[PDB]
Amino acid sequence: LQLQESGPGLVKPSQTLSLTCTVSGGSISSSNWWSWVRQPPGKGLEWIGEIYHSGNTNYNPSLKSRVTVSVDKSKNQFSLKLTSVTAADTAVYYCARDVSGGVNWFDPWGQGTLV
Amino acid sequence: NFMLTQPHSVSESPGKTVTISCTRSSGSIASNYVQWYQQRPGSAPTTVIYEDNQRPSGVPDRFSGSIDSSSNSASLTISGLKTEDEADYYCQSYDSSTVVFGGGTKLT
């Protein structure tokens, strides 16, 4: 199982973000969770939100009503639909998978996408 | 939500043992243990410590984890430093609400 970052890769301000992951070798219909951890340049880290394969997607209280995450098994990909992004949200975004197990374990990560 | 604090600018000669303490800001680390991830410049981060006592397959046995429950911090011990240990180390935890990453440290 290996995944690489994809998407259009735009940098214009006052627009909407749209990018999807790759995940080849694995199955979307499984017992795992997919995260969208965001890394700002020159600082720490910040989690955004996970999404189960079938019906329910968790989020983060801060940007709870500004972001949306979708999935599609037919195209074998899940995409991020951040809305109303300002010019202060410039960062490099990662694609992360976590094993359910009993705890959170964000591994393996993705190659990363510049933004 | 909460905050995490980590030491910064810690490095020495090879072959020594260094302890990095990731400390909870408010609350207690007793209901949700932490994990330690490592990152290479220009490369994606990779986990090295998970449940603070176990190690992933193929990981070196030099690194180890420990708990204190007194100062509310988790200690990562590195023994026998090598030239490939210069990296970025992050401590990650969670709670009943969300998942928050720590500030992180750099080792030269």
Added chain:
Amino acid sequence: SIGIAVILVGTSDEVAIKDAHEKDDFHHLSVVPRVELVAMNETDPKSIITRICDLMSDRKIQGVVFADDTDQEAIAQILDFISAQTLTPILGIHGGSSMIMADKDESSMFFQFGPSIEQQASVMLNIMEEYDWYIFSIVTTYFPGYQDFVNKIRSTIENSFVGWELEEVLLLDMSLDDGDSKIQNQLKKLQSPIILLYCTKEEATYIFEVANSVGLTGYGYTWIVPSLVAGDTDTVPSEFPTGLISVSYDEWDYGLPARVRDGIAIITTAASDMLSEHSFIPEPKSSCYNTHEKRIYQSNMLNRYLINVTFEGRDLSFSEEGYQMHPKLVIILLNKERKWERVGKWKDKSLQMK
């Protein structure tokens, strides 16, 4: 060296009761206890709590005894709470302490000195059988322990050859006042000649008043009541129907000096036995409050040692809930003059009349 304290509320004789704890040469015991006595008129929680703490702080005390000649209600509860919050095991002998309590906590060390709840029912039934009365009825209020009373009575009439014929068990309560019409009707319902009653003095006055007004206290009825309704024999509201029969602990033949002597003997015997068989004696700190380090080790060995005692060829084995398990009850009746006279004696399942 096992300091013993005694509390008095009834202002009875003090100097006269001195030979029991002085001239008793405990040849078979190796503890040589001391004895101190305090007499007061303390019945409020503050006074008794302050006195208990003052003796706790004073010097070298341990498990104490209680002797109050009054008739309180929550003295047993307060003493149980004190014994729960302080590992010193206390035990009452006479008066309000002698009344039964609902149920002690998990770790309380406080053993009473009176009859239990089930022995009262058993003696009640065998005295019913001894005169061939058979048919009866049961009436009770919302008092702590009524369920055990009913369960014991049913279980002990269900497993006997003799033909008991129970009839109705009314569960009237006085909490729902201003509705006495239903009480009047349900009391008028009863027809059986013998009526066991389970109540308390304050309620019993009301029940006897309504019974007298209804009129079912004439020639062919005979109420029977437990010990706690009697309370103090000397006091009487004069509303008690003549001929009422009550079973109660012996009071005018068992002297208080004997009670003090056997309490001291029980404490001394338990302490000496555990000292001999463990080479250790618990010594809690002599501070009533503000001491979070007093409990350095849980101590229930004394609890395990107070459930057995063999002195002077006598049995004083308490029970888990705290009873006597071998009392000597007397059954008394109210004659034409308002006074109580002994008519029967119970001793080790043996019943004697006159």
Added chain:
Amino acid sequence: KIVNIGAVLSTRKHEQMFREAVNQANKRIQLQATSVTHKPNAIQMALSVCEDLISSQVYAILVSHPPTPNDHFTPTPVSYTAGFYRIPVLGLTTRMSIYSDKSIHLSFLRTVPPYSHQSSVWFEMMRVYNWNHIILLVSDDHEGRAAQKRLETLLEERESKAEKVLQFDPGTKNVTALLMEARELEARVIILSASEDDAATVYRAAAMLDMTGSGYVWLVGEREISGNALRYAPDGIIGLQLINGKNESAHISDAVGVVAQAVHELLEKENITDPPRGCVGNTNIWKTGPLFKRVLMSSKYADGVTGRVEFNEDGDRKFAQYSIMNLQNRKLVQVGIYNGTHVIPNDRKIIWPGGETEKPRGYQ
């Protein structure tokens, strides 16, 4: 007439809130308030409580518990002193069901339902998801005994008893035998109710036996979700929570409102007597006390911050509001509501244990 009530709160901000609440209440016969702080030990707490009683002859005492250990160490001495003087005492944040026995605590009330009152939500959940077989698993204690008695009394209507009841000793280190026995009788729905520090051991043991896989359904109360019980817990565990079990401002407002209404209603009657004004001098009772409790029991409040307020003849509040939440990926989330009526589901799809989204039958 001038009558004042007293309270035993846990801080000074709560005292200011109480003062503001009584100030707003008396602006709608004048009443005041008196407050005191908790003490580490029980005996000084009780003597201080009765000293406060003697200070002004308080008609009722509003007691509350702090976020402190020992559970039932804070609210017992006040209840014992009140029972000595037979004056009403109203509790705020006491959830244990030991006080619900109306034989040793004759004068006691509760603004929140007891811990043993969450036995109807499970019944309605079974009646909604069509489950007819359970395996009750409790600890040998008064709480578990009361919970199982209430559950079996409720279930006796359908004439279909619980398949088995497993009682384990409170506090141990090996509960493997009980779980091994209970693994394979015939049933899947497991209902657990015990102490959190004792439920952690059960959670750890159940992981080794592979009983937390697909198909099985778990149900718990409220002590198994809070605390350290989240270290070991299988995802999909369905739990219950009280909507306003922590915000004490609403509780104190409702309590002061109902107490003020009761004291307004009683004074219109006749043949009354003031309660004793001495913890030391007087050694008698407060005869016109039970009438106050009786008139307070039927004090059906009109409306308030916490909805309608009523009482039963057991010292427990009715018409509680419960939230049914599921534990998904170590993160709680509300999925349903229960308002005394039938359970109303939200717009979220639960995740049943072991993964997969399909309501398990619960029977093999």
